[PDB]
Design a protein around this ligand. Sequence first.
Ligand SMILES: C[As](C)(=O)[O-]
Ligand SMILES: [Zn+2]
Ligand SMILES: [Zn+2]
Ligand SMILES: [Zn+2]
Ligand SMILES: [Zn+2]
Lengths: 330, 329
Amino acid sequence: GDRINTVRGPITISEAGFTLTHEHICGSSAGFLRAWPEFFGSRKALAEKAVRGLRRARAAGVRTIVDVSTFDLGRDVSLLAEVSRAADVHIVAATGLWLDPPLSIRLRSVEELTQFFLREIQYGIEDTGIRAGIIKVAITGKVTPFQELVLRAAARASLATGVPVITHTAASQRGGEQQAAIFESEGLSPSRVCIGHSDETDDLSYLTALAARGYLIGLDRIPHSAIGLEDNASATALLGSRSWQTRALLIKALIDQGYMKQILVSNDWLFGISSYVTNIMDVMDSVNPDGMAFIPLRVIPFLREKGIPQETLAGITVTNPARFLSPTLR
Amino acid sequence: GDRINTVRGPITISEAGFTLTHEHICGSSAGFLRAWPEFFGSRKALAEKAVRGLRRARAAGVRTIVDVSTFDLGRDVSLLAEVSRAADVHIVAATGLWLDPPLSIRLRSVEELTQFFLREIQYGIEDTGIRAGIIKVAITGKVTPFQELVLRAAARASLATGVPVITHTAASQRGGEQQAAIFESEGLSPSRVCIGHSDETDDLSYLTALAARGYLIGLDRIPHSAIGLEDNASATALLGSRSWQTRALLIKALIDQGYMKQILVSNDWLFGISSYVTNIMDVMDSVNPDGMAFIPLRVIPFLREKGIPQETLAGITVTNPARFLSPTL
Ligand SMILES: C[As](C)(=O)[O-]
Ligand SMILES: [Zn+2]
Ligand SMILES: [Zn+2]
Ligand SMILES: [Zn+2]
Ligand SMILES: [Zn+2]
């Protein structure tokens, strides 16, 4: 209603403050952090880096992050709770599915996946009593048959709980349209849906069209634009070629179209990553040493220079996430 | 050298007794049992079912099972420890990889995979201090590039620690020769390798030639048969269309060729399954109500009736697994 579930329990809407709506403590795989913590140096080393990173974001104004790591991204909510306490930053946990479901998940029906997402929202994650405050889904291309199952289960869990849905759009193929078609077929309100990674395209008319329909637009990979690395071929399939200012101008463009209320902004950062080639974390930290503080330290000042008023920036970073996350069936 | 790691700690090879070398408490995926236990009704219900089944096996003479569930098969070694203790049956845990590695595993180098396998053998699984006593690997058809990394890491781990390797092939497949090539290229002794699910075909030429090279032959899916379940595409794809007697006759055939010392026998049973279609566990329990007791209760006397001496059967069910499991550098 007016309360959001975090890994430290419920908080009221006003407590959320400046919120980054798409982040990760660790990008991994189910079971991996507990089976092979030394991959990250140690669990303690990962925890400590994440606490410093969160404290840095906090000093830059951030009060809440949404960790949209799912089961199959190796989400460890006990780790989230630990670093949230030590850094005094709220963390909202996620249910849903990313792009690496194991057999025990890939073989499930839409009704089974609905029950899974529901248990993580209504009951808790694993045996921790920590409840998810968001549902995350991922698609590739035009949306695969299994991904459509996931999208429908997500819609149904959202409809039962009021908790919103956030998507990973991995396509050069105006990937939102097919997502929206499926969500709407299920009776889900666009206002419960963020179409994420929308800063991956320059297709403004496409983004504006979604915004006009009531979808939230996730401009949430701003620092992955990067710059400089064409020597590592596996650094263009995780970063990019456009500049971060180019991505950030999409924020101004949507504002100018009159859809400031539809925008969510984030870094899609993390403090550890195992679901990619070894040492990619070091490359990422080199390119973006600001980490999760990139949005408040770089993008916000950049927008202010481009004439975006304080109140509009506060609306995007405080009010929109608050309205989005607050569980709602209207 | 004479001590085997179990989920309750070290045991002497004399204490292992009648050993089933290829079994599962639960066939699942990494993290799945702890994220969604109510898929199995509850964790408590799964544990209770495993203990009832293990106790029936114990009654039938079974003293040790080897749970060859890997990380990616959802191995929960805390569950293994709980049901081992309650059933009072030794359970040897596994490291290695099966057919569902996640990205964080699929993208690793042969050196990294070797370190992971060594961790689970030398240090312990997760934070439990429970050490693996066997390395499990799996292939599908022609060994994929990634599967070849897994096989080489398994060989390197086995050579460093002396614990044996056990392999999977898919339903009705014959990949031992492919696997053996890679293992031997790493300098691994065939006596440290069990070519598993070798009862999937009746290619006796294939079986005897591996045996002649010193490989253990895993005739380990004996009760798996979908005879009478022809309308069920999922069951038949899983269990196959060959009778348990047909599978069991391969044990006799290899004995008759003089290879009794190379034979390992098991059920490849499990008490919960999430890594396949829903409610497949109920179908399998209907097929084989004996569960893991199927080998001592049905296969052993079947072979007795075919004239195999009791001492040969004891050699296969006790001595062979002991020689196999005992760490040898
Ligand atoms: C769990 As199996 C059928 O790969 O031995
Ligand atoms: Zn994403
Ligand atoms: Zn992400
Ligand atoms: Zn197998
Ligand atoms: Zn098996």
